[PDB]
Amino acid sequence: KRLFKEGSDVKAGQQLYQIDPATYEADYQSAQANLASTQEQAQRYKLLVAD
Amino acid sequence: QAVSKQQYADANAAYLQSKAAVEQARINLRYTKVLSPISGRIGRSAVTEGAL
């Protein structure tokens, strides 16, 4: 979408366009899933070498 | 938490079994030396060297 009227007044910080985020939103949620996983995995192993 | 209670159990389990076995081994070994139960006079030996 192109959410602004040609010739209008916009405020700095105002969304002017919207790029299809479907996949970006997807990759991001994916990434976070992974992190949440590995992070735990690590935090655990950090206490195993300790012993 | 590095190891499940189950594992530590199985572990301490075997440990006890061993300690048990050793004690039993010790006793049998000790008996390879037949001893006189009381001071006294002893006579002929019924068993004979090399016998079973």
What is the C-alpha separation between A13 and A21, in angstroms, rounded?
A: 19
A32/chain B closest Cα distance in angstroms: 26
- Compare all CA atoms of chain B with the CA of A49 and give the residue at the minimum distance: B2
What does the DSSP 8-state code read for residue B40?
A: S
Contact (Cβ atoms closer than 8 angstroms) between residue A18 and residue A1:
yes
What is the C-alpha separation between A1 and B18, in angstroms, rounded?
A: 76
Of A17, A18, A21, nearest in space to A6 by CA: A17
Experimental approach was X-ray
- The amino acid sitting at B37 is P
What is the C-alpha separation between A23 and A28, in angstroms, rounded?
A: 8
Contacts of B1 in chain A (CB under 8 A): 47
Contacts of B2 in chain A (CB under 8 A): 47-48, 51
